[model samples]
Target chain A: NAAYQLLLSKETLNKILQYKQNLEKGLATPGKFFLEELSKQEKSIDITTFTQLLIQSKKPQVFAESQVYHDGTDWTLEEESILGDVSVNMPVTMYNDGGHGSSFKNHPKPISGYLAYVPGALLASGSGPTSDMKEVLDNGKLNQDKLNALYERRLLPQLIHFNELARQNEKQAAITIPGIGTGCFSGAYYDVIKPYVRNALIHILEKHKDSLPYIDIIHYDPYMGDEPAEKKIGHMSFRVSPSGVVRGTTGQLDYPLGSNPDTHILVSIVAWDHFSWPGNDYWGGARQTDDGVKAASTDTMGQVTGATGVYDKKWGRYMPPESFTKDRKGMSDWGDYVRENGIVFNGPVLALDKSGKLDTLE
Target chain B: AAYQLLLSKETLNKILQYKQNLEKGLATPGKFFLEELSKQEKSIDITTFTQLLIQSKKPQVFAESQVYHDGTDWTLEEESILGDVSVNMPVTMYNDGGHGSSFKNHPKPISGYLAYVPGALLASGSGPTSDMKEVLDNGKLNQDKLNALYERRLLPQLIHFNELARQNEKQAAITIPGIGTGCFSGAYYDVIKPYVRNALIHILEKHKDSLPYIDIIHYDPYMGDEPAEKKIGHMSFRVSPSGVVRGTTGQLDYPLGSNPDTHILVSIVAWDHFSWPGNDYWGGARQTDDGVKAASTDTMGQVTGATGVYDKKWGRYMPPESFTKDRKGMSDWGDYVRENGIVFNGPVLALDKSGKLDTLE
Candidate 1:
């Protein structure tokens, strides 16, 4: 512990220590927040990258270099120091979508990405024993381990990119990890990879709530086609199981979700497939119907008294405008989101400032 | 047509024009190759690389301190100019055992060569001024010698890589066996700018075009017991050698940042087993540039490259042997390998003095 402590900067040391202390004191859920705990603060979405607002105090670097063809033998991490002048270089694992929207279309030299960016480059999607993400999940038993392995191999590096930036720049990082997956949908012939996508995602969201507070899954409204938003949209709270399976309810459940007495993560589980937008329903900052938000959080027959008390979930929830632009349709980079939404500061803000205290920057 | 022609006034002006066009976003170095491939082309957009970690694929930057004019540079230029030496290239292996390639250099009409000579062979200066052998002979490869050697050779190699990387991206780089790896050398050789700063700059200069890219890298002889992260390299190195990287990605603005052209690839380092980039003698099995050729190492004739280390006990460089394990005119390596039970999945033909590359063994 001291070795790691010595390696990071003073602020980094304090942040991790505080995180550890919170866990010890049960002030924060280890990986996720319970429904009642979340009900205490307003919640909303943030997209830091799209608007390029300096969410993380560190200057964001673009790892626009040559493609690195590696086999787990390349790359590692260290804390990015804020005092350090330059931005930290980070090559990310993006949601390689089937559509032009998700793929980094405008990039001059398309950044080398995983979950398959190069055609047939997905070593996992091969004919051999390594197989696809599905088989790997099965082999890893769809457990928290598989989730860790995926995010570790992929997402953790991206997070490191931000952390390293934050470390060296003396700025708090506002990390916006896109809702990945669905890039695999192009290979429609083999539909063996569906649940693996959602399952691994839920497992990651529950396990990293403290580090990654919001997982934007991606939409709502008269702006949306006339299909009832209720059928597709769910309360942002997703019930993650001990086995890494996720279950959720759409309309205000007749019964309170907290009646189950388990951890309910704050993440969006959109009704998604290979072909869809970044997120839908309340996944983005898209406001659920005024009635929907009220009904979902208000105390009713099956509600938990602590959660829906008069000073409870409704007021604890952060509400946004009725309609959102396409980028706002998904949880994105925080700085960008903050610049757009005047009311965004009312919600749970991200990251620590130079003083090591967590606060929303105006 | 001649990619490696000497920078004649025409080619020099062409390069100048190329830069002018690139300034206008109309061209790149391999624009010739790109146009050739455009006959059958299409296209990854690199979105962001917030992490600025510079890495080397085979972290073991070799003892390339000695820039030996291994009687091969002329061969490279000549053969490349003639552009007619046909060779077999191993296409990228597929999971289902399939293969594909672009026609540009798949059969590499140009003269691509493998110069797998030893440090000693390359050590000997091509011109009389090559005091390289003297540097290596009297002294051990101390940081002083390594640093000086790298300093002298850095610019030339960077220019070589600048062209080579562009070529490789366009599927048109000279299939040289042991070049295009100057970045790694800086990692191990630098004392003033330690922790891979020099190597990072060299890498940035070389592949300036591949922005939003990350290199999977390692140090061949990594720092003991730690990932290379602890020893972070400086972002803007001290040297800006003339004729160094002048590629599509505008010159590296000192202190790599988020500027449109200023960048350092996210190089992630992991310690692992590595062969020197040119270790795959006779051209790499992949990237069928002039294609693969297997002549008996004996055909290379004595050109002493295996001057390993100066063993004081023997009062000479230790193990004065050839990397081929066979001395000049000695064909015993073939028999020697069979003695070691290594199969000779080798070609029967040879490269004769007549430059004879026929099947008649």
Candidate 2:
């Protein structure tokens, strides 16, 4: 036997419902009791800019980032240090790895320092994608086509949320950007993805130039992606000259760091160790060399681990920044993994012209 | 929060260079699950968790149940008949609300054990407020008024619990975690509790069922206030009729006596988000990593400081072990909501509402 029912009153329900309707429509507001409650609740990211901004410019403004390294981990890293008097602008802040993998590649750690944020879900590979799309992979494996649907459906909404969060204050100072993916457990091809990432930022900057300003590509070390500089035609790369002037460096990064007083990324000799440990050569991942950033799982983490760092299929395993064991045996893989995350977190930056103005690219 | 510490650059450099062998040991199924939760993931939020447990065929054919209504769609009303000796089993549970924990940026980690008393309910598919939209745009939400109205409204539900408990010892309870539960407000418990209590009390009063036929055992953080307005059959572990419980009267060939002769017990527990200390929430799974196993744990921490019997007047509880091997339990398909999802409302919604949150036997 299965049926049991409740004796319910209709009168009371109508009362509470009416209260909610009125408050939302701006017809009334909460008095002391509720006002106190609302204030106690934490302030969450508000989506006032869910809709796209409309600009009236015929041409777009070119934006740039000054790449640098600061091994010191004390003060908050913001923008004004390089982009002086950045009172009215914002960066398309490169924030998280937002990858849908079971790996740990995305490292926007110590993000309390950023100006705003740009979610790296669509850009990097680890720490995973949206919490909302978690149910998708539970039933079984993926059907290539549906993944793209989820990319737009499950993924884009999160990106929009992060985009709104990035410029929440709009007037905040420098944001030390610890950017996008660099495969370890999440075997992403740094060289292959550099294009989509570079172009992705370009599209965003060109699209929202008036309010958004510059980005700072932090080339912290080898484990994080500072392998080489990107080659894109659109935006200018802002650099600090010897005389202390912020001039545009046309997408060039060959100038050595601190040689003549300019922001430059440092490289580690660690990149030379083809396979520091025994099983390092085949740690675990898809053996194919051409794979780029995409969806991943536990099975996925291992594949990236196996086929990462070195570009060519035939080349020996060159885990981007494999900290080889020396007198101190602990400074190996897992140790390096810790360093990869804690010390540095920066990706490419893209900023706009702030005055709601654009310049012609043609 | 621990992330907000100040370790100088010199110190941090040392941590990054240390051997994280401890990290290797932490890579178990549980740790993996925690990370999964951090990202809003679930090892099994009932969907797959249910499938994994349903390997139900075995030679030990246990017991049976009697049902009612020629009605279609379980979504509607069915019968209220009692089953034969019901199966004592486990019910898996995890609160859907709470401050959650600080470790993961998510709700409570998924974990469940065993349940002693559990009863489900039925309704006409429409949730509490869905049908009340015409009245939706209204209430001051004053705490005193809401609370008073909510408690009083539970009278009908208490009576219903009384009837079902007498029929087959089906104990009834509301949810433990609801609003402050993050779930209470979301589930619209405040409005529902009052609406329900109001309606249910009307029915019982009209039938002349003494309002004192019901009682409540407010488990910890909440001490023993002893609801004097309503009274019920009993909550003693002594008169138990099953082998799991080596009670004062011991196991019986037949189920406990019916009506005024037998006793019933119900519990209010967290469905998710939080679990009571010493295992007081819902707990169970169909087939675990091994097989169909259920544990009845203890509801520890009491105000009286004494245990062992339910005096005939109030019928107190024995230590959970008196019921099983360290027995304890908790439910509610029980607490429903009123308008605007405010209060909790309960009523005898079904016949044999036995079994844990998720069950097998």
Candidate 3:
């Protein structure tokens, strides 16, 4: 008791009491009000410690996980299998229709346990079954105002209902929703969808403050990419404090082995055109004396050996420093080529230094 | 215990010395308790020790907190530029206001090549002349007009920066301002906050193909008396997509109402408050005065009677019979409000068992 008292002073205890009172009265949610207090104290104190002490006192079990992948693999199978043993809550998304019938059909098996239809991904254009709002997509853009309005109207109700369900069941549920607006609705992935998700989450957390401890939302992106090469998956596992500040692990999935290889090998196969040398033109040198014999023999490595007279007679005198530098006009400094159009020698240039000693420059 | 394991022999000795000092009255309990830890080779203040333990073992301790406020704090430092841009750079502000100079001074400090200049505020007469060719105000510009501006001016710069950064031989770090809020700007906080924050976040995430870490810092005047209620105070915390929101006690002084005896104090104060019964010359009863009070309190005490007195004092009491009656001659609901002229009470009608309570009779 003394340690506890020492850790939390009377002033902090009073603030906590006030915050709890506010939460009980429905004047503020645990997520928003508590988070605000946490945020304020974070500036001067270690909130993690304070929060840990509070959690220890409260005695509620919390479990969370995040995994990313290139393939839009079903993560819920494992989650459901494990979380199902314990009481769990998950959020589901729907279109304008109360039922997410077609969307569910897309999956191989129906989702196990409770599902709340949080309507999202309304099309900006066209009058179809999916289009819930009147606004048309001008140049493929959804009106932000209209989109927000739909969330307030449709999504908020579902969140409230889901919160009730979790409370009644006495199991903290993970509110899992699909990547809304990233599909046939043609919403840009980051711009439209991410903002909507964040704002909606904030709104839900704000409204359902008391449900903060009992509920958590699971936001999933099943669409990793088209191909294995294009795979770039990411996952962020975060928790909202009773005060509503968010903190979590945010990172991406590792690329598979061949997906991003370190080296590349390019092989080109072609027939030999003709024999050539840097010093002499084809058919004009001593090779012309043997007609096409030298050229033909050059093509067949088996016929031309180091011991062959033909190989020795033609190529022996070609190795010379003078021959290589004949066309070159050497410069004293390296910058001469850059500053002026000066020729660079390919072979080593031997010169006499001031002490009559030989110096080599290339 | 983890705590015991964490405490080194030196630390344990120091803590024991601190405890003995408090018991002997050689040192004060609160101040010296803290001072002893602060004096150690590796300082282990109560705050730091507690935080260390929490981070080590307890994952549930970290949760998202509310948006904090620090009026004195500025998110951007005095001379920090967000993105690197020359003349003809995307989102350039005019040098008329002190903003242009401010933008120029903040160099691209980080290794990330991308940096952005603060753009022109949309509304006219906010500050300097239009650095941007287009002028957009709430009512003046249509959705299309704003979209066009984003497409032509804003979006292009982002694309160009991304392209250039990709070509460069380093990890690109782009910095952009909150855009169009400060320096006598007319843009609404509700409008600009969502739009700009969302746009920037989305672009960064998509362009990089990674779950980007977004840091949002909001600053305000700490000790200002203003019309609006203050929702947040000084805070420094971070939230991740991975479900970890961490809060650190950075180098900041204690909050306004805190003292040594009281670790921290948050005041909820108001001035010169008074109460009156219903339908007075001042107007109908304040909701706080009667309605909410009666609804909330129990009937066991005289406190409940005071609540009843305020509710029944004046013509503000509309009985069940009065509620059942249809409007005699009023054409619209607006006319009814005028006739009643009570600020607190409004027309209340109900649905019948059969659902047709009144057929526009």
Candidate 4:
């Protein structure tokens, strides 16, 4: 408690005091440095309404993803910091894609999603082991232990709770399970490895939501074209029990990883619907659709509320025009625009002077 | 033939005219444009060289090592790039360690060894697989292909050929292995993987000598303090045939999905014996050693004329001074220092007069 308190009391207080003093000095002396500094401080407050902008405040962020090779070789599991924009450097093993795009396009690098700005401070205090928490149960740090217990007690129940809450929230956050055997398609690699991967991903996501608030969206980058057989792989699968055994039945209700039914998580599942224009939907900011009638908040259902309320199910949702171009086309046009001109910033083009809004140069 | 002849004709005539122009322009009046241009050119060249003389041109470099969670996790096996530097991003895993270091501890960022440079230019022509007899492999474009092929052909042969050639020419070029099995140990990822990787590296060095001359050098960032077996886990490992059994070993050497050697190659093994401060074998540059010896070079016999010149193979070799730092100590530091400094030009300082060395005011 003292450590947390110390961080708040000393470090934070000093920072605020410095800010106040600087503001006072700025009011007195009309200098360029003071005005420019004050503007940046004010901008951070306005950009994201809810949570602090993690980058501006300088908080660490963690990113993790499993990269599966197209040739069914192995998966490279990588975890890294999200201090800034990052590129995951895993090499993709390309095969003859059965008349696909390229004979050998190198593995496309993955980056963190939009909500990637979730700070590390929000992550569980320390590494919580889903594998062997019982080993050093007593020796682990109190903050970590408390967080793990909270997940066990609170978060697990919240998932189901959230599902019900979504039912009442809005028409947007509406919960609709097509069936247990919904066709989740990937390549042949995904077809064989689907059960293992699905279980692992679902388990990791729900159990580690605090550390990974940004796991609400998952898009697969298909290395090959669609196959007919991949459609049926979900039929052979059964949801495993708590002890990791196959529970035979097509009808099974969803539950969190830990043995808790109350905790309800609202995870939205979707994939790249078609592969015509943008090669991979998850390729980059460039090749994907900029604007149009795509999902507003990528993760939130038509009913559920997201951390960022811009995609609120309560609000009539459509992908922002800023997310795409006026042409209502694919991401290539977006990429082209950025390449020639640059990423647009919608902040005021002029500085505030005594008279009014003045042009930046003037 | 016609194209070649035309180029030669033009070049020869230009060279002859250049010689005549040089003679004519030496001490002539009314040549203000030429003199001014020449003076500017020399000033820019000197300025660039001076900038290069100061800092390291590149960031630190890293290599891939086999890391295993379950001993049977063969993911790192097929993918050697597991240990490769994750460029255009933040540093997640490893750090830099050698004589002159690239990283600073307490969360290492850009250090000397693992700094970022642009990726190798995509090879042109028939790719590395193409043979030398192809008629199209003639122009500057074809040179990239030839270089790629050389990396395949000559790289694996480095330690072997260097040993043989160094017996005669002394500085022909030599190599030793790093920590990774035989690959970094100057042995191939097998006689096969090494052949491909080394071939590409060697040919690239021979052709694009400046952009990416150094292939992979031995750099132990987490300088472990224990027996090699215990400390160096899946994070880094050796790939040798001896450890290639089905289920016995960590399968770092095995091909992914039980397939034989398909180049799932990631990871670039960079060398940095003269990178840091503690091992000041290099003289009073950056972080030099007490004795003023430069750091060791990755090209073992290229500089020291030694065999089996690995980290512990023969202890650390004391590199020569800055004069011999090129083929001796680390290559990135001078470039690093130059990039960081604010460059000043002699011409700008000497704007008042020509033909005189500018003195700093």
Candidate 5:
């Protein structure tokens, strides 16, 4: 009889699935269907008790927030404050160039407030000793041993920085990273970037088990139009029990990530905001659209004049156009405004001079 | 579903014992029957029997009071009160040794007995019969007469109920039917609601120390001429420690029958009159059309202030003259009182014949 009742529960689940399909096909309106079903099951269902069970089943032990950056230069504590006390990650390259170099050099300005600054690379660099190895990979082939060594060197320092921050904070800390070695580094997402980040996290957990309580590695997509990254990274993220056995993968897990105490390493993937268009290039046309810039004008005079009216109308606050124009006239440099406003490459592109000062590009 | 058999015989026996104790009125507080049931049945099915068992395990306190006429004629367990008064008594009392007796033996206008037990009370007459007769003959409640009745008749019963409340540790409640509106011969809620408010305030003032916080529910089956249209009647009031009261009155959408068993009485007890009697009843005088006179006394009626006089010019006081002369042969005076009324002094009182406004006595 007990076995028969178990079969009845399975049958009920199948019926629920059928009902969902009917709902998707527009056979039932949600309000009417729910009310009808509720009345039908009123004798058998206890709503209050069921809600308690559902809450307990899926509650997470640790919480994390994943922040996606186009290229890393515009990191600030102001934007990161939205996630409360959780630690935030900053992505970097092996050598300083583009957004990574700017972030690596300039982000540490207000050093005391800098909580967790884990900078890892997306590609090999010319500024460091790895410049000699550019020839070794001229055929566009990766040597696993050489790449593994490169990852260890790049990733270990980040873990040390993360561990230091975790020790100072009472609560759990989270580290956000883009799909490393996949963007400009041109490594395959699933076969290379996913496994490398996962294995490096495992290695760090084993080595610095005392310094770290528990850390979340969030794989953020660098560009807005990166749907495939979630699918690829999700497959690679799983819960590894303390006994070295993987319990559940991300998409297939019955409970939320980090719900079990034995869960040593947890992984998740996040999209930056919403999808815009295709291609992983964060500095190209898609970035321009994301930034809401329509024209090629780089002068503050042009940028301010075109942008002022929209900003005033949108938020119902006014910054007089005349005063804005007057301020730009005195500066004569665009980098001053960019630094003051903390403008990044993705949105509202501002030009920089060779000396790293703001400049107008005709 | 496999968890259905998870309730072992040992657990079933424990549940049965708890149910038996509950039925026998021997169940104690802090019993763990429900918690034990939850543990025994890993995945419990909420069957009708299960719900009944859960409900039985948790007991609530309820007391009912009935009103009767002042009839001296009485039997051992049954009494010969007036017809309307007899209907309000406990149905069990009508039986002559477990059989219904014809009420024809007792007729109208006879004085009644007031019987009270642990959880129930049966009362006679609306109040002190003479003061009630005075109001019936003159046609409305005055502050003096209202105060006199509260001091003599109502306060003692409220104190008795308070003692019962203390015995139950503030969790028990007493439900009394609408007083002074039936045999007492007063206009519906217009005369009764204010008197009840004043009486409660008086009780609170007199016994501030020993007064257990308790709920007083006034229940009536009737609501206006179209009583059938209104199913659930409700009103609420909040009394401050220093004797200030504020509240709102509204009707519930569902009938009393549809309300959840646990919350029905609670909801009714929470409703209040949309407005209270103004400062005129608190500490101020009735505001006349052109000016004002100070109140003779506040709600407690100590004679330290100005003499109380109704403002007739503003029609604050409506005597029988306010009614149309042609409007006669009405079945009850409640319709005439409500129809001829202007602004009621409180949320529900009409102007008395004296046309004199005084603070609540």
Candidate 6:
């Protein structure tokens, strides 16, 4: 009878209630002993930043100090070396592209070395203006009204030109949105440079669409725009500290890296020919010297040794030595030179006074 | 949400893994800290044996014992004192009403007290045979059949008849099962004994469909049953050198106990005349004793000051004086006397003196 009662309909509610009570009492209670026991038996992950730094520092000298290769004769091709300490100061400034007025080259004596220049070119020549704009916009079957508006605004005209150039080169130059820190022009800045870049890209793509493969025109930081003129104008100047001549470079290298196994970034450095007398008006007081010296007198011109060899003859007899090596002492003088010279990359070097200071073009 | 998931599907699997791993690595693992941590975290049954044992061992003098009121008179009860000793014994037995065997007569004897010749009366009359087999069952209830079968054949078959006679009152009785040292019989003994002690309560609830207002029966096996016999049994007939005892009288109380709250036990003892004289004879020594002993005589009958002072009086002077003082010598002599007198606990006690011990049975 007990067993029958246990299995009967009358017991069903009791059984359900028992289970409900058990769950409430056993599981809903804040302290479940079994669960607490299980909590003690857990595994943990072990990680440390020290190991990451070690790996980064020990990354087997990627390019090499200086490599020499001989094909037949005593001819040698030295693989580019990272020398003269391209030191980076804290808080680096990033720029949109080379189209910007002030760049790394505008710093104290446009960095000097054997230069390699590979541009993500953004301009086209000998093409009718209206036709070029139509062709650039039509290459990707993009909206005509948007293209016309961009052309009318003259934004990114150089990029628009490159698009046309890519078309001519038998390649489809597709556009993509930018990623963080990519320094590409977009957003309100789109009003300034968009037409120029967009026009240039269409020009290139239409002209070269058949001969070359597809190209990708990366659009980065579409929201980045100029600060108010008061906040922005002076900010364009580079700051030279004993640590390094730190400044922003624009449109240097940006791409998907896509599926292509081989991707190379070619950096170019341009030098000037002035000696000793702080030629801030010309070479921004940057000079080269024989071994180490402060004066450029009788110093060999192109035989590189150290920063004193950065021979600029204008301003004064004392040459502006390397910002580093001499410590922070030389930075103010070099910074003065970079400001006066107005030397820029992929842009014009506006001539100024002997102190490397600017004059308003009245 | 996270807590629910922790006790859900994922947690069950993890719990299984944790147990397997913990068991495998027990020897080498740093588990003491973990166990304490689990306890603080409210893990279930983490230290079962240790906790129960500690509770059992909590000690207090009899004066400090709690007064338990069973809706009758209040008795000063020590919660841990007796249970601790019993729990350590390893085997125990309990009783419920069945027949008029153990409850009749002075089935138990005492060290200094002789068996009261007329003995105690049975409180409940001799029950019908159906009380065992059919109360819990009939053709109408199929599910109850197994329970009924167990209540009938399984429990009664194992009870010693002398103990059956001892259920004179409503309160249950118990025994420490097993004969000697081996851990046998305890399993079967436990299975049946509890049912004997609790059967009336069950029948009252089931057939009568009412509360019986009875205290639950409990047992503990602290020391081995055999050693308890050696320590507690004196002239009790049911004792062996291996300290085994097989029979008992019904329940009794210590001198301080009173009604309702008073606890009692049925004990077994040896009597002289009831024993056999030799193995070759058909009849053994009956319950015989010499008339008296002189006050100065150091005889078996010479009264000792300890344990209430009753002593044996033999036919001649008395047993050697040393036997009264020495426990081993006395217990050995008692065992010899019981063997020679053909005294034992089970039904086989009626066996004849014959060529083979088995043939005697």
State which candidate has the highest lDDT. Answer: 5
Model 4 C-alpha RMSD vs. true structure (Å) is 27.8
Which residue runs does candidate 3 get wrong by more than 4 Å?
A: A1-112, A124-146, A187-191, A211-213, A220-362, B1-361
Full-model lDDT for every candidate = 0.23, 0.22, 0.24, 0.22, 0.25, 0.21
Ordered from best to worst lDDT, the candidate numbers read 5, 3, 1, 4, 2, 6
How does the DockQ of candidate 6 come out? 0.00
Q: What is the C-alpha DockQ of each candidate?
A: 0.01, 0.01, 0.00, 0.01, 0.00, 0.00
Per-residue lDDT for A1-362 in model 3, tens only?
Answer: 11010111222233444544554477743332224334543342233233332222210111111111101121112211111111111221111111110111111221223332122343322112122323323444556555555444434333444444555666544443433433223312222454454455445455445534444434332222111111111221222221111222110111112211122111000111111111111112211111112221232111111111122211211111233324543211111211233221111111112212122211
Candidate 4: fnat, from 0 to 1? 0.00
lDDT of 4 by residue, A1-362 (tens): 00000001122223333444544476423223223323554553231111122212211111111111111121101101111111001111111111111111111221111111011111111122221122113453223333333223212222232333334443111111111111222111112233333333344344544542222222222221211121112211112221111222111111212212122222322221111111112112211111111122232111111122122122112122343344532222222332244321111111222222222222
DockQ value of candidate 2: 0.01
The DockQ assigned to candidate 3 is: 0.00
- For model 6 the local lDDT of residue A132 reads 23
Better of 1 and 4 by TM-score: 4
List model 6 lDDT by residue over B1-361, tens digit each: 0000001122123333444454565322222223323443333341232222122211111111111211111111211111111110011111211011111211232211111010000011111122122222341222243233322222221122222223434322222111111111111222332332233223323422121212222112211222222111111112121112333222221121222232233221111111111111111111111111111111122121111122211111223345334432112223323334421111111112211111211
Judged by lDDT relative to the true structure, which candidate is superior, 5 or 6?
A: 5
Q: The CA-based lDDT of model 5 is what?
A: 0.25
TM-score of chain B of 4: 0.22
lDDT of 5 at A98: 12
Question: What CAPRI-style quality would you assign to candidate 4?
Answer: incorrect
State the fraction of real interface contacts model 1 keeps.
Answer: 0.00
Query: What are the runs in model 2 whose C-alpha is more than 4 Å off?
Result: A1-208, A211-362, B1-214, B217-266, B269-361
Candidate 5 segments exceeding 4 Å error:
A1-140, A187-211, A214-362, B1-361
